[PDB]
Amino acid sequence: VREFRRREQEILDTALKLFLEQGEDSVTVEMIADAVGIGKGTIYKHFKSKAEIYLRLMLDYERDLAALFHDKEALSRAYFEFRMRDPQRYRLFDRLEEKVVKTSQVPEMVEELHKIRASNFERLTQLIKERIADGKLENVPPYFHYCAAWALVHGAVALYHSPFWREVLEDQEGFFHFLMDIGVRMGNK
Amino acid sequence: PRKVREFRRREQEILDTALKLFLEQGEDSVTVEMIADAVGIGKGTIYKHFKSKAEIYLRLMLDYERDLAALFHSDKEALSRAYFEFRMRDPQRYRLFDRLEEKVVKTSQVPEMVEELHKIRASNFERLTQLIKERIADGKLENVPPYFHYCAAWALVHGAVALYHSPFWREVLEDQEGFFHFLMDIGVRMGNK
Secondary structure, three states: OHHHHHHHHHHHHHHHHHHHHHOHHHOOHHHHHHHHOOOHHHHHOOOOOHHHHHHHHHHHHHHHHHHHHOOHHHHHHHHHHHHHOOHHHHHHHHHHHHHHHOOOOOHHHHHHHHHHHHHHHHHHHHHHHHHHHOOOEOOOOHHHHHHHHHHHHHHHHHHHOOHHHHHOOOOHHHHHHHHHHHHHHOOEO | OHHHHHHHHHHHHHHHHHHHHHHHHOHHHOOHHHHHHHHOOOHHHHHHHOOOHHHHHHHHHHHHHHHHHHHHOOOHHHHHHHHHHHHHOOHHHHHHHHHHHHHHHOOOOOHHHHHHHHHHHHHHHHHHHHHHHHHHHOOOEOOOOHHHHHHHHHHHHHHHHHHHHOHHHHHHOOOHHHHHHHHHHHHHHOOEO
8 A cells, every 4th residue: 555655646747757858749658767767567556647637736736735724924925836837837727728628537536626626725715814804915806806806816827938038037036035925915995 | 191091990909809809809810811810901901011920929029028118108006006917917917028038028029129129128128227216216115126126017917917827816806996096005115215
């Protein structure tokens, strides 16, 4: 069971690494096995298909997001750090929405992904409502704040893919904490 | 002089009509012939203004860069508010200009206008960063590298445009003028000391 659980996480970790390096469409299950160091059938014990790996990566991501919500200012900062690190993975998951999530592939896992996304959406909304009630955020509809947070994250991901970022902007790590601070502070009363 | 006034007024009608057809049907579907027929003019006439669609594309982008330049030639807090209003007005044109960057700017089409475009963009970059530096010096913005504020402003605009295009988000936000102003506030206030 140790063998199973430890190897499984290594599958997922290698699979994501290959996806971001080479494009998810070019990466087969064959290739993930070679990189981990196991054979083909050893993988099928874990994931019946690459779509199962796709959904498991997204499911694990939503569960890490859920575990964040279990002080509110520190929480809001951690939420922006979580969303904004690994921009390449974020962009991979958006492609997966059209390619796998909006299809009949692995329906059991897709059903489970919708459910935890809806509960995570309600968790963020509840944080917003609490920070309005504390006087931290401006008293506007909570979806003003939710959409503003979606926009900052989405624009930040595009920024990290932009030729200006790659080549002109120097202190990228200092910038990162600057943008997280911006997220915590936007909409402040 | 009347002849110059009328030739220009027609030129603007062609550009206003072209942009409207681009945003309505997708820019690849729209031909110079469709633009000329919509304005009510012939083939040869529209050729007097633009030899090709790609010239219209680049003119639309140049005119946007010239609008941005005029904005900086106007207090700085009001200016920062006007900058974000200018950038977040017409989200559909922003997304068109993003497709045009790959389709016409980063190619060998209309090389004289593209060269022009990069020079005015360089000037607009300097003008925006100058505004940031003056707001830092006036104690409005945190004293961090000016390119931090520039990139934050780039991210907010880009995501706000994406917001307006996602089908999930148009329904969650019923109040579109109210939200836009909340977003305006956010832009002016972000990076504040």
